[PDB]
Structure formats: C-alpha cells, structure tokens
Amino acid sequence: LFGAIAGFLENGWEGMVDGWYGFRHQNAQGTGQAADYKSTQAAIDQITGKLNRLVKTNTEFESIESEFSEIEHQIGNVINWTKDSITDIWTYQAELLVAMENQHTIDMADSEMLNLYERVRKQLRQNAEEDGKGCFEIYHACDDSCMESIRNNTYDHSQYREEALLNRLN
Amino acid sequence: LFGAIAGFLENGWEGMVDGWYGFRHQNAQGTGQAADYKSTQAAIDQITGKLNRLVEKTEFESIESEFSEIEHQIGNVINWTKDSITDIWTYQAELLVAMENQHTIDMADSEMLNLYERVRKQLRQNAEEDGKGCFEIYHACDDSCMESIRNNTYDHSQYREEALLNRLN
Amino acid sequence: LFGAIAGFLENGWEGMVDGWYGFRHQNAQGTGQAADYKSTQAAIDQITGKLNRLVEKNTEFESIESEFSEIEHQIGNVINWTKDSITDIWTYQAELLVAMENQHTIDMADSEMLNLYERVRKQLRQNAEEDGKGCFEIYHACDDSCMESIRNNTYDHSQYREEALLNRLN
Amino acid sequence: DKICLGHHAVANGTIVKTLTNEQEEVTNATETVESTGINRLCMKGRKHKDLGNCHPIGMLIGTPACDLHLTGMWDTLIERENAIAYCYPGATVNVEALRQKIMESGGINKISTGFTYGSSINSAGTTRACMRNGGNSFYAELKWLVSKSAGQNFPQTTNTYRNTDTAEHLIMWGIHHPSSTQEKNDLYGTQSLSISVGSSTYRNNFVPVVGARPQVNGLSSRIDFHWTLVQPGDNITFSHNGGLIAPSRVSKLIGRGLGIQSDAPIDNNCESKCFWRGGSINTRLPFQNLSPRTVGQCPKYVNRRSLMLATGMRNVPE
Amino acid sequence: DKICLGHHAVANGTIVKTLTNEQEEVTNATETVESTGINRLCMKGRKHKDLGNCHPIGMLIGTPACDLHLTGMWDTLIERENAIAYCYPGATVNVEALRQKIMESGGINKISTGFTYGSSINSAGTTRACMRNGGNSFYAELKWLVSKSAGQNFPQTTNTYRNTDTAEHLIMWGIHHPSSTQEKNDLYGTQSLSISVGSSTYRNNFVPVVGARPQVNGLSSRIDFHWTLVQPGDNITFSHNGGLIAPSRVSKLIGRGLGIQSDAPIDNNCESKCFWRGGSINTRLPFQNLSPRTVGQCPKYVNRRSLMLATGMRNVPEL
Amino acid sequence: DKICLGHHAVANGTIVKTLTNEQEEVTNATETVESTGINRLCMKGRKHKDLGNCHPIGMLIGTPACDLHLTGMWDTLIERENAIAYCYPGATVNVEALRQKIMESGGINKISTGFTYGSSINSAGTTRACMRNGGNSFYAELKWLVSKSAGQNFPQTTNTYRNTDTAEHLIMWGIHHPSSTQEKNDLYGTQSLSISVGSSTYRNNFVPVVGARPQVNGLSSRIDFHWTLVQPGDNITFSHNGGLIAPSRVSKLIGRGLGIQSDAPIDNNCESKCFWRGGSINTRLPFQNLSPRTVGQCPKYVNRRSLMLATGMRNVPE
Ligand SMILES: *[C@@H]1O[C@H](CO)[C@@H](O[C@@H]2O[C@H](CO)[C@@H](O[C@@H]3O[C@H](CO[C@H]4O[C@H](CO)[C@@H](O)[C@H](O)[C@@H]4O)[C@@H](O)[C@H](O)[C@@H]3O)[C@H](O)[C@H]2NC(C)=O)[C@H](O)[C@H]1NC(C)=O
Ligand SMILES: CC(=O)N[C@@H]1[C@@H](O)[C@H](O[C@@H]2O[C@H](CO[C@]3(C(=O)O)C[C@H](O)[C@@H](NC(C)=O)[C@H]([C@H](O)[C@H](O)CO)O3)[C@H](O)[C@H](O)[C@H]2O)[C@@H](CO)O[C@H]1O
Ligand SMILES: CC(=O)N[C@@H]1[C@@H](O)[C@H](O[C@@H]2O[C@H](CO[C@]3(C(=O)O)C[C@H](O)[C@@H](NC(C)=O)[C@H]([C@H](O)[C@H](O)CO)O3)[C@H](O)[C@H](O)[C@H]2O)[C@@H](CO)O[C@H]1O
Ligand SMILES: CC(=O)N[C@H]1[C@H]([C@H](O)[C@H](O)CO)O[C@@](OC[C@H]2O[C@@H](O)[C@H](O)[C@@H](O)[C@H]2O)(C(=O)O)C[C@@H]1O
Ligand SMILES: *[C@@H]1O[C@H](CO)[C@@H](O[C@@H]2O[C@H](CO)[C@@H](O)[C@H](O)[C@H]2NC(C)=O)[C@H](O)[C@H]1NC(C)=O
Ligand SMILES: *[C@@H]1O[C@H](CO)[C@@H](O)[C@H](O)[C@H]1NC(C)=O
Ligand SMILES: *[C@@H]1O[C@H](CO)[C@@H](O)[C@H](O)[C@H]1NC(C)=O
Numbered sequence A: 001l002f003g004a005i006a007g008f009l010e011n012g013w014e015g016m017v018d019g020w021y022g023f024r025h026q027n028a029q030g031t032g033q034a035a036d037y038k039s040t041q042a043a044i045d046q047i048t049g050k051l052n053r054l055v056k057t058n059t060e061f062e063s064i065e066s067e068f069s070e071i072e073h074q075i076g077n078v079i080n081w082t083k084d085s086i087t088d089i090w091t092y093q094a095e096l097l098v099a100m101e102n103q104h105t106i107d108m109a110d111s112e113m114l115n116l117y118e119r120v121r122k123q124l125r126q127n128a129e130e131d132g133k134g135c136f137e138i139y140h141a142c143d144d145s146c147m148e149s150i151r152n153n154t155y156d157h158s159q160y161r162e163e164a165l166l167n168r169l170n
Numbered sequence B: 001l002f003g004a005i006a007g008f009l010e011n012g013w014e015g016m017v018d019g020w021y022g023f024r025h026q027n028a029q030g031t032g033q034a035a036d037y038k039s040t041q042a043a044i045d046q047i048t049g050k051l052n053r054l055v056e057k058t059e060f061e062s063i064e065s066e067f068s069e070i071e072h073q074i075g076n077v078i079n080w081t082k083d084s085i086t087d088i089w090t091y092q093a094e095l096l097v098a099m100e101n102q103h104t105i106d107m108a109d110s111e112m113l114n115l116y117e118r119v120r121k122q123l124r125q126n127a128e129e130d131g132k133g134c135f136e137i138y139h140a141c142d143d144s145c146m147e148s149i150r151n152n153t154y155d156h157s158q159y160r161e162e163a164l165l166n167r168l169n
Numbered sequence C: 001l002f003g004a005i006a007g008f009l010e011n012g013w014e015g016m017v018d019g020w021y022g023f024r025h026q027n028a029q030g031t032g033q034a035a036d037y038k039s040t041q042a043a044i045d046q047i048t049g050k051l052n053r054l055v056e057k058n059t060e061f062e063s064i065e066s067e068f069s070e071i072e073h074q075i076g077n078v079i080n081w082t083k084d085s086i087t088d089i090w091t092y093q094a095e096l097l098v099a100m101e102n103q104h105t106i107d108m109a110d111s112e113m114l115n116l117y118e119r120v121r122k123q124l125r126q127n128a129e130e131d132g133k134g135c136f137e138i139y140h141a142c143d144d145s146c147m148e149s150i151r152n153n154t155y156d157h158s159q160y161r162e163e164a165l166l167n168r169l170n
Numbered sequence D, F: 001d002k003i004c005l006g007h008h009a010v011a012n013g014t015i016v017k018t019l020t021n022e023q024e025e026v027t028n029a030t031e032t033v034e035s036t037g038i039n040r041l042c043m044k045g046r047k048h049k050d051l052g053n054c055h056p057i058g059m060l061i062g063t064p065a066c067d068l069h070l071t072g073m074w075d076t077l078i079e080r081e082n083a084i085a086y087c088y089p090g091a092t093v094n095v096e097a098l099r100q101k102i103m104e105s106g107g108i109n110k111i112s113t114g115f116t117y118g119s120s121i122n123s124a125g126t127t128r129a130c131m132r133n134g135g136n137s138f139y140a141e142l143k144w145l146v147s148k149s150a151g152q153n154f155p156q157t158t159n160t161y162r163n164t165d166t167a168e169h170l171i172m173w174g175i176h177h178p179s180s181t182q183e184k185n186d187l188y189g190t191q192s193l194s195i196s197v198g199s200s201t202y203r204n205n206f207v208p209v210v211g212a213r214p215q216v217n218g219l220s221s222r223i224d225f226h227w228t229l230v231q232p233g234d235n236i237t238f239s240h241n242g243g244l245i246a247p248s249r250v251s252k253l254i255g256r257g258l259g260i261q262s263d264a265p266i267d268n269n270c271e272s273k274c275f276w277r278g279g280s281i282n283t284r285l286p287f288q289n290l291s292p293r294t295v296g297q298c299p300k301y302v303n304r305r306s307l308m309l310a311t312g313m314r315n316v317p318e
Numbered sequence E: 001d002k003i004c005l006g007h008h009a010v011a012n013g014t015i016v017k018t019l020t021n022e023q024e025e026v027t028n029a030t031e032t033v034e035s036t037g038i039n040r041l042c043m044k045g046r047k048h049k050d051l052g053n054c055h056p057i058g059m060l061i062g063t064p065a066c067d068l069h070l071t072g073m074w075d076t077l078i079e080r081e082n083a084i085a086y087c088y089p090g091a092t093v094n095v096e097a098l099r100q101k102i103m104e105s106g107g108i109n110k111i112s113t114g115f116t117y118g119s120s121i122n123s124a125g126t127t128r129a130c131m132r133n134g135g136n137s138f139y140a141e142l143k144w145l146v147s148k149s150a151g152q153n154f155p156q157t158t159n160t161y162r163n164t165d166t167a168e169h170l171i172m173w174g175i176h177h178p179s180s181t182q183e184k185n186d187l188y189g190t191q192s193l194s195i196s197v198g199s200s201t202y203r204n205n206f207v208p209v210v211g212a213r214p215q216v217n218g219l220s221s222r223i224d225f226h227w228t229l230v231q232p233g234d235n236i237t238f239s240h241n242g243g244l245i246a247p248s249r250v251s252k253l254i255g256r257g258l259g260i261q262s263d264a265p266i267d268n269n270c271e272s273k274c275f276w277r278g279g280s281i282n283t284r285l286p287f288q289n290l291s292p293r294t295v296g297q298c299p300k301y302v303n304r305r306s307l308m309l310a311t312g313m314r315n316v317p318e319l
C-alpha cells in the first residue's frame, strides 16, 4: 500500500469522468478541474495487460465418461476421484489468481496516484508546501496559465522562487 | 519493501506491547511511549483477512482398498495420479506461504511508512527528519503538544513563526 | 511502482559496470562515478534467494504407459486425459510463477533504488534540494572528499547548514 | 492559491475479493468464469457426422438404424441419447473400448470378407426384430448361418479372411445363444456346437448356450458380439459347426476425429472448439461453471458461480 | 525536543520462508499443515454401522460372521482388517466393484426370491466350514442344492426371480467347483453340468470344474460367487442341472453413505468429516501431512512437515 | 554543484513476461524450462541390467534371447524396442500387468518346481521355432509334455508346487493350442483335454482350442501363457490331460528397481535420476519440455519452449 487512494486522500471525485487521476485548482480567477492523461494511461495499460494475460492456448481433451451409457464401477470411481481432484486444483487456482491479481491492481492504482503527487511536488520545489490531504498550497499568484503549466509539466520554479520564499517566511 | 522496517529504522522496540506501531518522544517534562491504534489495527486486520482465506473450506470416496489387493495396472495408475496431485498441492502450499509471507512483511513495512508520512505532513515546516525515523521539533512541545501529534490534532500554523526562526538561526 | 527506475530517473547508466545502483557527481574539480555496494548487494541477495527457491527439488515416478507395446484402450484414454490435465496445470503454474516473480523482481529493484535516494535525501537535510530527475543540488562547495562522505553515509549536515541555508535563501 | 490532486470514483462500486479482504469495493470489475453456453453444436468448419438414432457400434454391424452411416469420413462424430446398436437382442464384449475407438476415429471404410458357404448352409437368416424395407432383415454387415435343411447338422465349415491392406481392420462376429433345445436343433442340428476363431493375435472358442430368459423385442434368444483387430498381412479363420453369426464385411477405422455425446441440435453456421452435453462453449474466459464434462479445447471447470477480477482502483465515494 | 516512530519487536521470534529468503524472522507465525489428528473414528452425529469381523460381501451372501449385518441403514459403513467374507473357500468375480458399491450405500434390504425346488432336490446342504451354534450350516442368503438321492442325476431345473419393485436389485449366486470326480458324481450325478443365467440385460453360462487343489478350511472344493443387477420390472432366470448355489434372498442397496476402512476404535463423543486408516482428522487447516489416503471432506495432503505463515512483521531486535 | 543517483543499464536487454506486460525488457534473465536432454542412459551409481533384445516376459519363461537374464539383481532394468519374449507363436494373458511387475522389481531368483512325470510322458518336447546353439529347443523354464507313445492318450496327471519360502513366488505356465485335430491326437491322444490349476487363492480351467486346415490360416499352433502368484506356505496344483506346458522353475521377484524403456546407449560415467525414451535429463530447472513421458525424479513437463525468469531490473537505455 502506498498511502494515497484510501489513505491521505480523503475520497475520490465522482465528478472526474475525464480520467482516473487529475487536478483541482483554486486561484483568484476561480476553481477548475483537469485529468492527467499520462498517469491514467499508465494504470489502464497495466489493467489491459492483465486482461490480455487471462484470455491461454489450449490442449484438446477427449471424453473418458460416457454421457449415455454406464461405465464400469471401479474405473468410474477412479475417474470421479481424478476429475474432482483436478477441479479442486483449478477452483483453488482460480480463487488465488483473482485474489492476488486484485490486490496488485488496487496497489498499482495507488502507486500511480502517489507518483503523480510526487512528480508535482518535486516540480513545485520550494514554491509550495503540502497539507496532509493531497493539496499543495502555492505561495505565489498562480495564473490559470501557470496552473496549466503545473499539469503540463512545464512549470519553471526559479521564475517564482523569490516571491514564493518571501511569502513562506513572512 | 518500503524502506522503514529493517531499513532507516535501526530496530524494533521490545518495550512496546500495546500496539505494532507507536511514538517515542523526549521533551522538557521527560520521555514517553504511546502505541498507535489506527496503524496497529490496519495491519492486524489485513493479517486476519489472510487467515480467514486460509480456513475457508468436496467429498472424496476411497479408490484404493486398505485391506485387499488392488489389480496391479490400475493400482499403478492410481499411485501415479495421487502422487502427481500431491506434487501439485505441495508446490501450491509452498508457494502460498512464501508469497503470502513476502506480502505480509511488506504490508507491515508499508503501514509504518504511512504513519511516518502522516506525521511528517502534519508537522509541516516546524520539524526536520533526522533520517533514523525521528522528527527534530524546532519549538517547545510539552506533553499535551505531543499528544496533539498522535491524535492528528496538531495545528502547525500555531507554532510556525517560532519554529521557522529556530530553523533559520 | 516505486517511481524511480523508468520513473523520475530518465534512463540507466550503461557506463556503470561495478554495481546496479550508484552516484554520479558534479563539482569545481569535475565529474565522477561510483557504485553503491550495499544497495546492489541487497538487490542481488534477493535475486539469488529466488533462484534458490526455483532450483529447489522430489517424488519418484514409475511408468504407466508402455513405450513399446500397446495398452488397453479405455485405461489408455484415462491415462491420457489425466496426464494432459496434469500438464495443463503445470504449464499454467509455470507461466504464473515467472510472470509473478518477474513483476516482483522489477518492483523490488525499483524499491532499492528509491530507498538509496531517500537515504541520501535525508542525509543532506536542508543543505540540498531535489531537481526531480534524481539529482540533489547542493548549496555549498562539495569537494571530492565531501562527495565521498555523502556516498559513504558520514556526511555531517550541520557542518554546512549555515552556508547552505543562506545560499538557498539568496 | 492552491492545487489539489485526486482520483475518480463512481456512486455504484463493485465488490471483489483480495488476499486480505472478502468485501473490497472497486470502480469496475469483470467475470473470469463463463456461465453461459450456446445451445447448439457449432459445427462450422468441421466435417461432422450427426448419427441421429444410430449408435456407434451399430455402424460396424449394420443395424437398420445405421444404414446411412455404414461408411463415411468425418473429423467430428456426434452420438445421440437412446441411439440404437442392436435390433436382435444381445450384447458386445468390451463394448465401451469399442465405442471409444469408433468415437475417436475420422471415418470408416467397409471391406468384403468374401465368405462363401456351400449348399448345406442358408446364409440368409432374417428376423422380424430387424425390419429394413418393410421386410424382415438382419444386420447388414453380418450373416445368420443356419442349416439349409431344417433339423440337419450344420456342416463343419472353415472361413478365412486375409487382411491384404496396409492398415489394421476391425472384424466383428456374433455367437447365437438360442432360447430352447427345439430351436437350437432346428437351426443347427442335434450335434455339439463349437466355434473357434483365431488369428496371429487372437484365439478363442465359443459354445452356443441354450437358456430360458425374458423376451426382448419379442425374442428370448440372444446374439453376443465379439471383435478383434486384424493386422496388415494377417489372417483370421473361423471354424464353426453352427451358431456363428459371420462377418460379410469388416471395418477399417480411418484417421482421427473428436467424439461428442450431446443433446443439442447442429448449427453449421457457428464455429466452436469446446462441447458438452448441452452444446458448445465459446468464450475468452479461462474458467467455466457450465459443466465438468467437456470435450475439445475448453476453459477449465471450477466450483464457483462468480470470480470478479478488478479492473479499477479502490472506490472511495464522497 | 523530538518525536520518534517505531515498531515493536519480541525477544523470541519465529522463522518463516518468503519468496526471497528461506530464513526470515518475524514476530509471530502460525501452522498451515495439520500433523496431529485423532487415532479414533469420530462418529458423533453419524448413524454408523461397525461391521467388526464381517466383510461387506458377507452381508450379501449371509456368512455367519455377518448374521447381525444382513440388513440395516447407515450413513457411514466401517470395514475392519481381516473381515470375513467366505466361510466356504472361494472367491467373487469382480469383487472390488461389488465391495465399493456396498461401501457407497446407505443401507441394505433383503427380498425373498421365492425359489422352490422339486422333490428330487435336497436344498438344505450344509458344511462344517460355515457354522452356527457350533454345528454345520450354510450361507444364510443361499442354498446348496444337491440330488436328494445320492449319486443320481440332478434334475434339469429352472428358477426365475422377478423384480416387481421400482429400484434395481442385486442378486448373487454361487457355482460349486467340486474337489473330485467322485464327489461331483455323488452330489450331482454323472451328467454334464451346465448353469445358465439370463435377464433382459445379462447372459452368462457356467460349468463346474472338478479339480485337485489345496485344502482351505479343510476343503478342496470351491464356491465361486457371481453377481448382477436386476432392473425394475425385469426377470432373471437360472437354468441349471447341478452346481448352482441358488439365492434365497436378493439385496437392495439403499441411498448413499461413506465407506471407511480403518482399525481405529470408535468414538461417539467427537465428530469429524475426514477419515483415514489410523483415525480422524479434525482441523481448520487447508493442508495435512497425516496421510495420502483419506475419505470424506479432507485437507489436501502435502509432502511437508511444516509451513509457517507469518502473522506479524519482520522481527528486528535490539543489538 | 550536484550529486545524481542512478542505476545501471545494458546495451542488449532480455525480454521477459510479467503480470501486466509481455515484452518487458530487463537487464538479465535465466531459463526455467529445460529444453535439452542427454541422448544417453546415464547409469553411474546404478546397479543396472540392460536386457538388450530380451523382453522382460522372456526372463520368466526362458526364451533363448533371455538365457543370460534368467536371474539377477538390479536397481535399474532397461528394456529395448522389439525385444523378444516368445520363440513359439503365442502370447501371455494379462501381459501388461506382468511386465510392469518385472520392471518394478529389484531382481529375480529361480526355484525349481521339482515336477516329475511318469513313463507315459515325454517331457523333452522341443521345436525348431525355439533354436538354441543350432539345435531344436524350448523355453528354458518350461517343459512341453507330450505322449511318449504317439497317438496314445496322455495320462491323467497331477503336479503340485509348494511354496516353502517366506515370500510370494510367480509361477507361469503355458497352454498348447494345437493346429488341427490330427496334430492334437498325435501329441495327446483322442480324449477331451482339460487343464485345471488351483491354489488357495486361485482356480481356473483351460481347454486347448484346436485349430483347422492349413498351417498358414489364422487358427494354427500356438502356446499361450498364464501366470499367478503363489503365497508363502501355499500350494498350487496342476491337473492335466494333455496340452499343459508345465513350469520346471518358478520365479521370485525381489526388491524394487526403476524400470526404463529406451533405445539410448548406456553411459556409466554419467549420473542421473530422470529418464525418457530418448535418454536422460539432468537439470536443476524445475520444468522441462523434452517429453510428457518420463520416469524417476523429474522436472514437470510443460507445453512451453521457454519461460524466462528476470534476474535484473528494468533495462532503460539512454
Ligand atoms: C417378468 O416376469 C413376469 C412374470 O412371468 C412376466 O409377466 C408375464 O408375461 C406373460 C406373457 O406375456 C403374461 O401372460 C399371460 O396372461 C394372460 C392373462 O392375463 C390376465 O390374468 C393373469 C392371471 O390372473 C393376471 O396376472 C394378469 O395381470 C392379467 O389380468 C393369458 O391370457 C395369457 O395366455 C398368458 O398366460 C403374464 O401376465 C405376465 N405377467 C404380468 C404381470 O405382466 C414378464 O413378461 C417378465 N418380463 C420380461 C421382461 O420378460
Ligand atoms: C457326501 C459325503 O458325505 N461324503 C463323505 C465325505 O463327507 C467324507 O469326507 C469328508 O468330508 C468333509 C466335508 O463334509 C461335508 C462338509 O462339511 O463340508 C459334509 C456335508 O454334509 C456335505 N454337504 C453337502 C451339501 O454335500 C459337504 C459337501 O459334500 C462337500 O463340502 C463337498 O466338498 O461335505 C471334510 O472335508 C473331511 O475332511 C472329509 O474327510 C468322505 C471321507 O469320509 O467320505 C464320503 O462318503
Ligand atoms: C509330431 C511330428 O513330428 N510330426 C511331423 C510334423 O513335424 C511334420 O510337420 C512339420 O512340423 C514342423 C514343426 O515340428 C516340430 C517343431 O515345431 O519343430 C518338431 C518337434 O519335434 C515337435 N515337438 C513336439 C513337442 O511335438 C513339434 C510340435 O509337435 C509342433 O510344433 C506342434 O505344432 O513340431 C514345422 O511346423 C513344419 O512346417 C511342418 O511341416 C508333418 C509334416 O512333415 O509330419 C509329421 O509326422
Ligand atoms: C434364421 C432364422 O431362423 N430365422 C427365423 C427366426 C429364428 O429362427 C429365431 O429368431 C431364433 O429364435 O425366427 C423368426 O421367428 C420368430 C418368431 O418365432 C415364432 O415361433 C414365435 O412364436 C414368434 O414370437 C417369433 O419369435 C424371427 O423373425 O425371429 C423367423 C425367422 O425366419
Ligand atoms: C501344502 O502341502 C503340504 C503337503 O502337501 C502341506 O503340509 C503338511 O502340513 C501338515 C500340517 O500343516 C504337516 O503335518 C506335514 O508335515 C506337512 N508336510 C510336510 C512334508 O511338510 C501344507 O499344509 C500344504 N499347504 C496348504 C496351504 O495346503
Ligand atoms: C461418479 O460421480 C458422478 C457424480 O455424481 C455420478 O454420476 C456417477 O454415478 C459416479 N460414478 C460412479 C463411478 O459410481
Ligand atoms: C469495465 O471493464 C470492462 C473490461 O475491462 C470494460 O469493457 C469497461 O469499459 C469497464 N467499464 C467501465 C466503467 O469503464
């Protein structure tokens, strides 16, 4: 577990139908919301991968049990025991596959959330600080164009650093 | 692996007995030890979830007479089949436990890290990490302030101006 | 999954042949590279751990179908169905084994990279800042001996803190 | 000024199981166990033979119900419930081995034995129990030999079939077990009856046994069937005194095919690789809970109604 | 002024294996492989029948050892080592299929065949090998038919059993293989012996074979047993002239139950769903290493003494 | 003034599969599926017997090809293709059970039955179909009994083998099925032949099946074999009239061995625990794709050419 999705982020946003992860900002101009295409595609691609590995090339089996006529009792008992043993193995394997796959899928999605968070944190450098809940309090005036530059991964921290640091200390 | 347990935390505390994870502190008044309930239960609940899957539970009849001879060729087919089934279950049992143990250890490591990270973002700019799992706090923090850190009630902005002066001088 | 290898680290270093993880530095005297022994060993020990489990053997089996003579048709069909079922089980288990193992091996190596990064970051404390691509910009002259002290985990941050803080602030 | 990170969620989540949690809610999930089949035998792309009410064994001996299926070629052979094997009452030794051989075959050819009998034998015995064209008849690949002069001793007779082919042939014969002494005497005479059959790889003796027993299709006597494989170049000889039901043709099983026992009608416009008594299973899912008895290339049977694979993150509603 | 994060540890930890380490120390671990089990047959809640020294086949033919086990109902049938099937020497054709059918049933009823024999047949043959009250007797569900007048030809005889019931019945008969020509002649006469049996679905013929062989219970004769199922509404007819050991009752196997082969003593105070030769296995654990041969609802057998599943974190004690 | 962290990469990575990705490039990988075996039977450390062209059944009855394999001790027994079991036409009833018993054994001892025959019997019957050192001979462990005086009735005869040992013995006998009534009368007389065999646990009757007409048809002379186990303390008796091929020795299977069928040359320098038709498999790998038919302690067969296990991190070149 990576601490984000059912962790320090209080809840999901049902209003974000645009993608799996994303931004909400608040500046003097107003509020707004955008989905991050890169992190969502990284998660979706891994899901796709697990589904591609699910849907195996198979062995040809023939009948060893007559549907319409009786089978000798001893051999039929051997066959019953064998098929039931095989089915117990596959039932167990199927349950385990899905339980294990599911744990990994949930933790992978948590990881992709955290990596986005961490990428934005390093990008903001000393111009911002974290609240506990997954927001960044930005200590300069951040334009709608400035906001877009934080999502766009093009934001230049050195350009706002003087202003931000003054506000952080004062 | 998340880097805390058997990582940047030198070791575990034998003296802690009311939880899996907890806080030690030192201030003017002295030192104190309190376990953390919420992280301790997150870990334990995941363990009991695995244990439940473990004890979830097909009727088999006999196909090998204990007290009388079995026809030799069919007796050989049965032995081969039963031994093959047993190789499969033995392998599956070894894999289950190994894979489960791996995960359990790393999940426990994870809950430690998550508690550490919760406190870090809580303390904000009023403290600094020493790298051994401790937060050096740059203001005076009495026993009620310490409890304020454990109950997730610590308001950083209350000590901020004083803390920053001490961090900068 | 841990965000470092094939994450915020752009690429690997083909030039580093004495270890899995390491350090490149930049100071007034020039450039250097060294491998980190502990983290590469931590990773190799876990790999060799897995290889040991792999080659771990066993049950003795006898023949139940004749290579050189015929056997009765109905039991021959039962043996065929049973052997093909057993093989489908082992083929599935073999494919799951390495898929799962490989996922874990890749993420474990990512994790050892991250923990090295985190170790260094904590050591430097307030004397450095992250550039977001795996480097620490240090705010004091750090000669070859000071670089060694960082890689050797004996860098004393308080020795440079004063100078570092006023360079970070100006 | 502030920038916030988050993930999506939905109002209606789906529950999945994990290693640590029976009841975990995620944004989306899909089934891994197939529960629905196709109620048709999907035969497109297969040279299939639907036997109807003809039983596989009946193809070798030529029971009236199998007249359309005495020879052919197929890669898929379909047997139906209450198929008919025998018109005259009786049974076959090692019948399920024989049925399974026929059901893995890719066709059957028939070859004359060339057996001829002298003037003392009537080889055209027929019965009300085997009607063919509104007339009393008999298994098409066999001949009921009886004394031409009723009550007279059936003559000592020797018949040999030689396999001059390059593949094994399957040969079938019957032994008549009359229901009374009077019947046995009229057909074969009062002498002791004995039938011996031998090849390089088979030797056996049979004696017709008179015995009271219930009527089946109106008849108390029985014909028991036997079979063996005659290898290329080898010969099989019958020495008999009366009571032999002699092969007039032998079979050759050709190639390989998939045998299906099923209730479902054929759909020659649908394709499939997996079959069961109900029909076909066409799915990309690795597991199924339709039926533990399938043939062909199938998903594995599992004892579970449902197994949901998560395809999304934990769902955390507002 | 500082606050520190930590985890617990313990003085004595336990070793488990992981994917990367066969010697990983952790705070706690628990077993996944049952190794103990109970050396008794836990029969609580089961309507069981302990056959004792009675073999399941003996129930059908009525060997003296099975006189208290000729009928009954059960959900669990217990068979013991060296149980007795045959008092007179012989064997049953297709015996293991028949034993497995009985061991799967949930009871047996007996139904009279109503067979009757003409005056020149002595139907009350007995032997010192099957004794009741310390005297000569015979299988309770069968009759040893011989010529009443010694040395005379046994008459040609027919007997038909009719199944008027709605379930299949199991009919058993024997064939006597005498030890000598003289014995054969005295019991059945000098004629050739032939027994034929036929139903709508079954047909077979048997010939008594005179042969020297070693004495078993003092006897060189043998009675071999044969059996077949008679479907509802079908008849089975015996045509015979000497050598038939004729059934006086047929059996009906009823419902299902679990068959157990074990010598462990029975315990009525504990319950269980899993059994083997040495007793019962009562565990929530998914694996067991007690036995590869079990019946009922059992943990899967594994080739390991112990597999510890970690139930705590890594154990890192103080240096 | 900078310190950078990083990881190695390589020029040529290896492609492996993961749960989420086929084609994941990694810095190093090793194979988990053994694809190469040794085309030899590695027998170092094994007391073995290579039977050559002697079939295991031939060891018990003493076919000339098996003269050097009538007794012995081994922990490994190696059977070859086209090995010889019989020198005279015929076959063994229940043969595959018997062969598996022999191929599971650790050796064989022979014990004389002690049988002797009255003056009316010639026990030295031989045949040009079983040549030994250029002379007409017979199975070494059996005796062909015929009437001393041709055409006269073979006497009623009794022979009893007593097992006075502490382990079960395996006794084999043959039944001669003559080629014609004329041959049957010359060997054994005009009477009805009957062979009865009985122990405490076994009884059976055999009646020779007399063939007919030319020697080249299917019903000619053969000798078929039967076998049973004789428990410690038990006696087995033969009563016979003509047609018995009597045992002059019985066998005793001892201990356990590993039975191998293969035509691969033996190598004594080379140690192994796993074998198939084509040789040995010596590998630490847990899977193999050489053959679904192996014996010994073997890696599990899988239907995969290759399954690569990552031994390195993701390979991310510049
Ligand atoms: C199984 O065994 C059964 C007992 O033998 C067989 O049932 C019998 O088959 C015969 C011939 O078909 C029937 O015989 C005839 O009876 C009628 C008169 O029937 C009426 O009167 C009788 C006597 O009171 C009464 O029991 C009936 O229910 C009728 O009301 C005569 O006119 C004929 O000449 C001839 O004697 C038997 O009736 C019949 N029994 C029954 C109950 O059906 C049965 O055939 C055997 N099954 C097989 C598979 O062979
Ligand atoms: C037929 C008869 O009485 N013959 C005399 C033999 O009994 C006698 O030999 C002894 O036979 C003993 C076995 O006798 C019984 C038996 O208990 O098995 C006596 C039964 O009444 C008889 N029952 C029937 C239905 O025949 C039974 C049966 O005939 C046989 O089992 C068939 O084998 O035999 C016992 O084996 C003794 O060891 C044996 O000496 C001989 C010698 O006295 O003389 C006969 O006239
Ligand atoms: C009894 C006899 O000698 N009769 C003469 C026949 O041998 C002969 O036919 C030829 O028989 C040949 C086989 O002869 C042996 C054999 O198999 O080698 C000779 C053995 O001594 C004899 N041994 C015994 C125990 O009897 C043996 C045995 O009887 C048979 O194998 C049983 O079938 O036969 C061979 O098959 C030739 O192809 C065949 O012509 C005929 C014609 O010459 O005359 C007989 O007097
Ligand atoms: C070859 C031959 O004999 N065909 C006969 C046939 C056989 O003799 C018979 O099947 C041997 O049992 O019998 C046919 O008659 C059957 C007929 O016989 C009557 O006597 C009886 O009363 C009827 O119920 C009925 O069984 C037959 O068709 O089977 C005639 C055939 O020509
Ligand atoms: C096998 O036959 C021998 C003799 O044919 C039987 O042994 C005799 O047994 C009796 C009592 O057991 C002894 O008094 C004799 O001394 C034995 N004879 C010898 C010379 O040892 C033996 O009982 C038979 N085995 C079976 C099972 O019938
Ligand atoms: C095997 O089990 C199936 C499932 O109930 C049942 O149809 C069948 O009768 C059993 N067969 C035997 C060998 O008795
Ligand atoms: C649910 O998953 C299936 C397969 O992964 C996919 O077809 C579907 O689009 C998903 N539904 C949603 C809500 O995205």
Ligand SMILES: *[C@@H]1O[C@H](CO)[C@@H](O)[C@H](O)[C@H]1NC(C)=O
Pocket: D162, D200, D233, D234, D235, F216, F217
């Ligand atoms: C079969 O009969 C033919 C013709 O007599 C003969 O050529 C051939 O040898 C016989 N086959 C065998 C194997 O005896």
